[model samples]
Target: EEASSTGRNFNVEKINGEWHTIILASDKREKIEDNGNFRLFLEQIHVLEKSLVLKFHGSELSMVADKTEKAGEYSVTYDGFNTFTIPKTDYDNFLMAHLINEKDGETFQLMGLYGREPDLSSDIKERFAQLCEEHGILRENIIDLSNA
Candidate 1:
């Protein structure tokens, strides 16, 4: 039987012998453009396994990622521009928020900022924090879109 809806955009499902879900992404491409803006403000720094590739709404930027020692921190390049340090140590959350959907048979998208706004509700944030915690992210590691 399908899980009952809880009036939320995300749902928990059993897929590929692991937990998975499909997210209702809003403004996928617009967030990419905004991420480009965030990149201009960031400095270079640097992750991988299982290959979690992020998709945007429009096709304008190309994102290449590599392995990092941490779960929340990663090294990625947008259009071959300067590398950027993620989760700027000062922001409250990630620049991008995501709709959690299973990436593969076992992977799920952790909702956070990449270059998006910080507008998720407190309950959402708490759940997101819990999700990240499972992967070793601290509450302070979240970030938001800050100007250069």
Candidate 2:
């Protein structure tokens, strides 16, 4: 096509700036296919505390974690950057005990992120829930406990 303005795949191009700005372009197609057909897949997820539900095309929305379950999209969680202090909560009591002593499954579980991995070899859902309860870590969720 013949045109006054053309978009070229250039090694370097100039733009308006203090002096000049150059953008270099390169062409290489591999690593992965970037097209409409490429689907977004969830490998694994860590859950902290939030709501997440999964719905299959013709199925009802299911909890992100249950016994023997996996999903295409993961609902992972991490500790908030700034933790808010709870008032008269079991979580606060547990914090006192945990800070004072270093013994039991409670301490161990607090230090590790179990389950939530793409590795099917684990029974993460149970382990996470069980450990969360033992640690007295209570919130809306320990993992994506939505819809369950």
For residues 46-141, could you state the per-residue lDDT of candidate 2 as single tens digits? 232332222222123223422112211122222111111111112110110011112222211221221122222234344434544565554233
Pairs in steric clash, model 2: 46-76, 46-77, 47-77
User: How well is each residue in 1-148 modelled by candidate 1, as lDDT tens digits?
Assistant: 2221121321211110111111112222232244433222221111124223433333333345543463433345442322222222112222322323222243223334331231434554455466555655455544332331
Off by over 4 Å in 1: 1-118, 146-148
Global lDDT of model 2: 0.21
lDDT of 2 at 65: 28
Q: Which has the greatest lDDT?
A: 1
